[PDB]
Every structure is written in C-alpha cells, then in structure tokens.
Design a protein around this ligand. Structure first.
Ligand SMILES: Nc1ncnc2c1ncn2[C@@H]1O[C@H](COS(=O)(=O)NC(=O)[C@@H](N)Cc2ccc(O)cc2)[C@@H](O)[C@H]1O
Length: 426
RNA sequence: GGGCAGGUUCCCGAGGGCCAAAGGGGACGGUCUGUAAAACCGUUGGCGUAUGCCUUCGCUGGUUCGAAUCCAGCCCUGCCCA
C-alpha cells in the first residue's frame, strides 16, 4: 500500500526529496519510472554500486519500472561531482566497451523482465542534441549558481583549473530525465546536484519534477574514501567468492554498521547483536551473506536472517558454525582460515613456463616471479625479498640471486595471500 | 594579445656533475595482530644480475666536457591587464 511502500523505501535512504511527492506518486497506482544512470569510466560494478542498485531492485519488487541509463555519452564528457581535478578525457568507444560489463553485471541485482526493466544508452538522444537545445539548457542556470557547488567552489578558490565543459555535464544528465520522463532519479549523495538540476530542466520542459532519491555512499576498504574503481578500494560484484569473502573480512571495523545497513536487510536489532559478538564474528556473517548472495546468478529480493539460515547457517551460532553453509562459501571461508594460519590454500592458479625462458636449465627467482605475474618487475621482486615478502615452497626467500629449478612444480607466494603454482612445459 | 608567479616520477613538492632526483602523502613488504585499526622497521623508474645503457623532470632547439639546473623560442595553468 502507498503508505507502507514509502516505509520500506525510506529504510537506508540518506534522504528522499521531496518526500511528499514520492507519496503522491505512489498513490497514482501505476508503474513509476525509476532512473539510475552510471558512467562506465572504467569496467565492472562494485558493492558501492550495489547500494543504489539494490534500492532499484526494491522498487522493482513493488512493481515499478527501472530505467538503467548507460552514460556512454555523459561518460565521455566526465562528471565533475566530487572531483578535485578535471576528469581525464574518454572516448565514446572506450565508454561503450566498458558498458558491456555494466550491462552484464547489473543483472545480478536487477530484475530483467521488460515490464520491470529497460536499458538505454544516453548517446541515443544526447548525440543529436542541437546547439540551439544546448543554449536553451545552459540558459536555465547562472555562473554564481554553478560556483556554489562545493566542487567548483573549492577548486575555484584554491586556483585549480575548471574546464567550461565540466559546466555542461549536469545539463546532459538532466536532459536524460526529460528523455525518459523520470518519476524518480536514484543516486548516491555525490549526485545531489545533478539530480536537482534534473528537476530544473524537467520543469523547463513542462514535465513533473522527479523525486530525488539519495542513498549514502559506501566507504571503501581504505577506511575513509568512497568505494571507487579508481581508488582501488573496492569489492567487485563478479569477483570470485574466495576473493569477495577475504575482502569483506578486511572491512575496517567502524564501517561494519554501514556495510550491514547499505548491503543487507538485517534489522537494526540484529546488527547490534553481531557487533556485540565482536568484530571478527560480525565480519564472518557479513562475508557469508554477501559471498553467498553474489555467488548466485542474481541476488535474492532480501538479504535477511531468513536468507542466512536458508544457506545452512544458524543465527544463534554467531559465526561459529564454519562447517555449515553452501559449497562456494565454505571453501571460500576455508581458504581464508587456511591462509590466516600461514598455510597454502587448496586451489591455486597454475602457470606454465616455456623451457625457452630457462637460462642454463634454471630461472632467476626474480624473473620467475615476474613471468608468474606476481611482480611487475625483477627489481621489485628483489626488493620484496629484501623485505621478506616472497616465499618459495613455503620458505621465505632471502637470496635475491637464487636460481630456481623447475624440474617439478613450485609454489610461489607474494605477501599474505597471493599464490601461483608454476611448472615447466616443453 | 600583454605582465608576473608556476609546470619535476602515482600525487604534492625540494632542486651545473656523486640526481633516478630531498621530504611528505599514497601504495607496497614486514612485526605486532583478527589477512582490522593504531604503533613500529623497511620499499617505492627499468634492464641476467650494472663504477654500462634506456625511460622519467611541459615541448623544441641551444649552450657547456656535462642540463632537471643556464639560455632562446614555444605549449599549458593561476593571479594581474586588456
Ligand atoms: N561507493 C558508493 N556508494 C554508494 N553509491 C555509489 C558508490 N559508488 C557509486 N555509487 C552510485 O552509483 C551510481 C553510478 O555512479 S557513476 O557512474 O559515477 N554516476 C555518475 O557519474 C552519474 N553522473 C551517471 C549518470 C546519471 C544519470 C544519467 O542520466 C546519466 C549518467 C551513482 O548514482 C553513484 O552515486
């Protein structure tokens, strides 16, 4: 029911604005058009994206239509939201290549039934947008209004260059809302301004101003910055279960609550239970939930206590029942425990080394780590040895000049958890 | 178009030979640890293993035995001017 729908949607949301409009729209008893755009500046989605995407999923389950806009054209312009410097240039070919991963992976969270979902690339309409149209859009706002954004304010005062093209971006995003007659636009808090310009431009085109639905930003593994591909602080949605699990175990403790609120549906009471049980046991449940969820082709409608138990775990164990749970998660958790103990994991990548790479029937340890893809350079492999960062067959290397014999397979290790098995091939 | 300050590696930065370039950040490796934080000790162009070479100091040319350094023109940014 209208009143009870808004209740669900509100949970987790930073702010809906204006709320009174969302209520009105829900009462119209019809499928609302729900806009989420994403610029594929780099490939692959992450749990950060899942924050907004999973709220889109919640809209779909209440029978509303999600429009996923692939920003192939905006992508080339570059969104200045949250940016300390002009985004480096990007071509339409590059953004279109990247967009494949977005379209593929968005399915893991979104329902794909035509009535619930539509896919569009904004280049469809933006490419043929005319100079006259651009003049009309850019007449809707003033300089002082643009420089009142935190981004440009800081950049302008501190004397950091701002390219004029950066001033166009919001109008492109706003026009998208017109092009699809958006009832609701979804975004993280970093998208506030673009969403608000969406309301301006819609009004100017004699449409109803969309509801601006703002979610909180998921902080990355570094512990401060927002999860982003570029900051290399992310957990990708299509990472192997082993990898998602270990990464979720490394989430800084202060972030745990937000991770539970933004990424799962556990009631506030259930969260505080887990936190009481302690940091490590909390991590285990988080890791299990999400690794399980994203291991599936598509996540369930809810990631809740009921989902946890349907896996094989028991809530009251509070992350002790390590034996329980499905296969991909169990072997993922096993690996984590095994590596934590200072052991070699069961399944490791094998890499064959052509015999031509040998010199006098052996290979320098440094080159071997490079060939194996564990070090970017030989110089780096030596310095990693100086810092006791490399292991051969379980034993910490100390001889940067070691000559390795590949008569039989050897296990190379870099740092705590990167392992390759190497062997010869004629 | 015309002044002045600035352009250095992933970022910010210090700067006639011994400068692959101080220091700081970030990242990486290690100890402690819970594959957390924090603290602490290291590392931070590349090359089969280097008194050798290549890549990196905005560009191009010049000077000098030798240029990140000095010079000339030129591309770019900020502040000032028009
Ligand atoms: N770590 C994170 N936590 C929470 N939300 C996150 C996040 N990282 C990204 N997001 C959200 O995921 C969405 C996609 O991010 S993004 O690709 O950088 N978005 C943008 O650049 C938008 N300007 C894309 C766009 C929007 C609308 C359009 O009509 C066209 C394009 C945004 O709503 C963003 O807020």
């Amino acid at each position: 029911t209208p009143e009870e729908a808004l209740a669900l949607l509100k949970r987790g949301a930073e702010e809906i604005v204006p709320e009174e409009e969302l209520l009105a729209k829900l009462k119209e008893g019809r499928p609302l058009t729900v806009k989420l755009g994403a610029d594929p500046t780099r490939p692959d989605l992450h749990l950060g994206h899942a924050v907004v995407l999973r709220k889109m999923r919640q809209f779909q389950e209440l029978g509303h239509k999600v429009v996923l806009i692939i920003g192939d054209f905006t992508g080339m312009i570059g969104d200045p939201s949250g940016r300390s410097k002009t985004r480096p240039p990007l071509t339409l070919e590059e953004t279109r290549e990247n967009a494949k991963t977005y379209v593929a992976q968005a399915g893991k969270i979104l329902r794909q039934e035509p009535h619930l979902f539509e896919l569009r690339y904004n280049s469809e309409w933006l490419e043929g947008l005319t100079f006259k149209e651009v003049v009309r859009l850019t007449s809707l706002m003033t300089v002082a209004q643009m420089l009142e954004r935190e981004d440009f304010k800081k950049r302008y005062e501190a004397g950091i260059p701002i390219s004029l093209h950066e001033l166009l971006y919001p109008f492109a995003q706003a026009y998208d809302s017109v092009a699809i007659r958006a009832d609701v636009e979804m975004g993280g808090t970093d998208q506030r301004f673009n969403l608000l310009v969406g309301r301006e431009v819609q009004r100017a085109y004699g449409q109803s101003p969309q509801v601006c639905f703002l979610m909180p930003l998921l902080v990355g593994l570094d512990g401060r910055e927002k999860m982003s591909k570029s900051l290399d602080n992310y957990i990708g949605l299509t990472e192997p279960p082993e990898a998602m699990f270990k990464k979720l175990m490394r989430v800084p403790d202060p972030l745990l609550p937000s991770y539970f609120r933004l990424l799962t549906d556990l009631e506030e009471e259930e969260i505080e239970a887990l936190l009481k049980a302690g940091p490590v046991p909390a991590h285990r449940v988080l890791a299990r939930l999400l690794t399980a969820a994203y291991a599936l082709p598509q996540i369930p409608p809810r990631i809740d206590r009921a989902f946890y138990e349907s896996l094989g775990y028991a809530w009251e164990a509070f992350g002790r029942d390590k034996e329980a749970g499905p296969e991909e998660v169990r072997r993922a958790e096993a690996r984590y425990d095994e590596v934590a103990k200072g052991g070699i994991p069961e399944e490791i990548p094998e890499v064959t080394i052509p015999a031509s790479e040998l010199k006098e029937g052996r290979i320098w340890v440094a080159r071997l780590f490079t060939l194996a893809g564990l070090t970017p350079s030989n110089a780096e492999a030596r310095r990693l040895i100086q810092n006791r960062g490399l292991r051969l067959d379980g034993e910490v290397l100390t001889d940067p000049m070691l000559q390795v014999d590949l008569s039989r397979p050897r296990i190379l290790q870099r740092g705590k958890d990167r392992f390759v098995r190497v062997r010869l091939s004629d």
